Each structure stands twice: as C-alpha cells, then as structure tokens.
Amino acid sequence: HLTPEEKSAVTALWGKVNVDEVGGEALGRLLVVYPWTQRFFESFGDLSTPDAVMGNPKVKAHGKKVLGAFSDGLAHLDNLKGTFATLSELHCDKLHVDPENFRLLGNVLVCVLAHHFGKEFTPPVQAAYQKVVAGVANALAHKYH
C-alpha cells in the first residue's frame, strides 16, 4: 500500500543502510528492551547484560540474516505474503513466536533507522517504513491467520 514516492524514499534510504550492523543492532535492542524474547535465543550465549547482548557474535550474525530477509522483502513489496512463506512456517510451526513480536522487531528497526539517519528520517520516510514493517510482520504471521 505504498505510493511511488514512498517506494522511492524507502529505496533511497535503504541504499545507505549498513547491512553488516543494522540487523544486529535491531535484534540486540529487541533482546534488551523486550527481555522475554531472550527465551528464543538461549543458545546464543550470555545475554544477561545489554553490553553482553550487543557484543554477542551470534546475535550479530542472526541480525545479519534478519536484515537480509528484510532487504529481500523490500525488493518485492507487492509479494510480501509469498516472499515470507517459508520464514512464516519456520517461525510459526516450529518456534511458536507470538506474532506481536514481529511488530515489536519492526518498531525496533524503525527506531534504529531513526537513530542512524537523524534528520534524514523525516516523518514521511518513517510512515513509509512503518507501512513496510507492518506488511512484513503481517506476511510473516500468515500461518497464524
């Protein structure tokens, strides 16, 4: 449900996103701010301190994978439901992740983008990205529907 202007703004801002650290930051901040989500990552090592979470190589690598999935969803904005079918089955039929955590992660990603880009992250850019992350969460929660 993105206008061409919204799609262009989203693409332009995503072009400057560091794909090596943004996903790790988003996932680590999710773990710190919503600590019940740490239940799903018990094999990631020590997550007791925010510094330990943000310094965790496994958290960084998984954030890289999640950011790659987000970029894949951004490349196909008109087929999010079909892009995230396998990931939806993995998250729902195997991990039992509540779909509200998808929205939580999307909002954490929006906060990380704001923290990185500052005044470049204008309210219209944020609105376009909110549409994007809401669509991604809805597509990822399709098995629950």
Partner: protein, 139 residues
C-alpha cells in the same frame, strides 16, 4: 522501574532540554502520519504540517512528560487529572498510547543519536509505558 532507569530517563529528558515542545509536536505529527486512525481524536484540529494547534498540543504533552520525569516516584498522583481526561472524557483506545510512545521514542532517537544507547532506549521505553498505564487506569 529501577534507579538506573530513573537516572537514564532523567539524563535523556534533561538533555532534551528546551526543545521538548518541538519534540512533542514532531512526535504528534509522526503519529498522525504513521497511524492516521489517531487523527479521529482531533476532529476540530488543523492537523497540517507546521500547524500552531499541533505545536501547542505538542508543547502541552512535552510539559506533561517533563512533570512526569520530575515526579517519577509519584506519577499516578501527578497524572491523576490527565488520566481522568484520557479515560472518561476522551475515551482513548489504549493502543494509541503505545503508538504515541513509539513515535516519541523515534523522535528521541532521531534527535539524540549519541544518547540513544540500548540501555537508555530500554529505560525510556519503560518510562513511556509507565506514563501510558497511569493514563489508562481510570476506565
């Protein structure tokens, strides 16, 4: 909350400083753009960009948040009148409080990049959620 959370929130809001009204207006504009269903609560408002009405409302919200920061240990008593207005007269759906809290956090992240560490982020999330629970405790 926690004493460390209180210190983090006090530091972040203090370094927000005298721009709090601008921050609140920007957060309200972000909420109106991202979640247009929140605009139904302001039908007699001019909700265009740069509107003086939204500027004044953001200033009011920012002053309320500053008072809540100053009275972190007595928030339910400091916010009693506001909680009665939000729940009895306005009857705001409690999801909109989460929406406004998210937009406030986004404004803070965009304006204080150095201070938006993960720990400060968690502290601010806890503070704003506590203000939202106080404001939604009179239904």
């Amino acid at each position: 909350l926690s004493p460390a959370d209180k210190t983090n929130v006090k530091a972040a809001w203090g370094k927000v400083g005298a721009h709090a009204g601008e921050y609140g207006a920007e957060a309200l504009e972000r909420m109106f753009l991202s979640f247009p269903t929140t605009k139904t609560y302001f039908p007699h408002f001019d909700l265009s960009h740069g509107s003086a009405q939204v500027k004044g409302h953001g200033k009011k919200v920012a002053d309320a948040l500053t008072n809540a920061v100053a009275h972190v240990d007595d928030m339910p008593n400091a916010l009693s009148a506001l909680s009665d207005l939000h729940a009895h007269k306005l009857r705001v759906d409690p999801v909109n409080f989460k929406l406004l809290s998210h937009c406030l956090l986004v404004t803070l992240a965009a304006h204080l990049p150095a201070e938006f560490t993960p720990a400060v982020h968690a502290s601010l999330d806890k503070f704003l959620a506590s203000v939202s629970t106080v404001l939604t405790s009179k239904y």
